[PDB]
């Protein structure tokens, strides 16, 4: 389904921290602007995407769920193809781009059993959706949900910190008040600008807003 290829392309552009504009989508899929526009209209009617006022495509909860599953199948296919089949690594991504459309959930569950590790694709990116498969401003500690979000730093509050080893890590990552960074919760909290895994005191006292 062309729908799956559009949703996965949006997913991938978002992971790369690129705004999912229609022209970006068109260019990545090697499809015309007008063709992309016609497909985006069908996808809005289907409830999978909305076109935001800055013209970027924002996937709905349903659109995002489907996108996520397509990416999971793509990445599990890449692991099968490299770890077990041994297809030349230069061909693995293009093979998996086809296989992601035809792999059942049942095969994915089997792949999770058989593969050594399903943490990441061979190309370094996390395999999403495995839980779904079945097996002032605000303080960063609070504002962080569990999926990555771009936010703006308002206070770092160095003056209140007892532990200071991360001051330089923040500097080396160019995180200052004003920096736009992506924040994430884990099984410990993390900032992206480089990746800084915050100890609790900092996570409790650094503040983030959003425009």
């Amino acid at each position: 389904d062309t729908t799956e290829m559009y949703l996965r392309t949006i997913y991938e552009l978002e992971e790369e921290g690129v705004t999912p504009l229609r022209a970006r989508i068109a260019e990545r899929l090697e499809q015309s602007g007008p063709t992309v526009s016609q497909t985006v209209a069908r996808m809005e009617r289907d409830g999978l995407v909305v076109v935001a006022s800055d013209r970027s495509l924002q996937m709905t909860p349903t659109g995002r769920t489907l996108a996520t599953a397509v990416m999971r199948k793509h990445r599990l296919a890449e692991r099968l193809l490299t770890d077990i089949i041994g297809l030349d690594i230069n061909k693995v991504h293009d093979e998996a781009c086809r296989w992601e459309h035809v792999m059942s959930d049942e095969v994915e569950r089997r792949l999770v059993k058989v593969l050594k590790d399903v943490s990441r694709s061979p190309f370094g990116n996390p395999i999403p959706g495995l839980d779904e498969l079945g097996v002032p401003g605000t303080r960063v500690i609070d504002a962080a949900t569990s999926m990555p979000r771009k936010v703006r730093i308002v206070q770092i509050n160095e003056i209140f910190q007892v532990k200071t080893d991360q001051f330089t890590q923040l500097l080396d990552a160019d995180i200052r008040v004003g920096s736009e960074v992506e924040i994430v919760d884990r099984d410990h909290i993390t900032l992206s600008h480089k990746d800084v895994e915050l100890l609790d005191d900092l996570a409790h006292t650094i503040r983030i807003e959003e425009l």
Copy 2:
């Protein structure tokens, strides 16, 4: 490509010894007669099939080559899915029906390396095309090409045989003068009606024609 699914269906019906009529094709693919007819017309223009005077579809050399490759990919997929992945055996055929369309030759070559044996599918049928992948009347000894063909028995010539252990095997298989049987050459010659692997004396003296 719908073309691949039509050619593989023809292949499969032929293997089952069924005449590949358009209605049989329609029924197996769960497509309408008129839809099948429109696709067969495109396939004739493309040079992949001819419609014979008995209305059966006869694949051209090119059509047969493509059909063969689709079947090979289907069967290698089934071996991957059962031997390595362990997908529940009741789901393997339907999964492979999708995978046969997206598997590259390069993955098939890898599967030949990794799998224990690629003689047959899990469902008992030979994996064709591996050589292409890269790794009176006439006497039966002569008339047999290397691919199976339906022929008619004209003489068995029992009277000239020194070895007679196969007389009963032929009887048990219902091969008599008049029987329509499919003959095949191997790396030793064989008759099908049951399968009788002929010793040379019989293969040299049994005669076959065709209407």
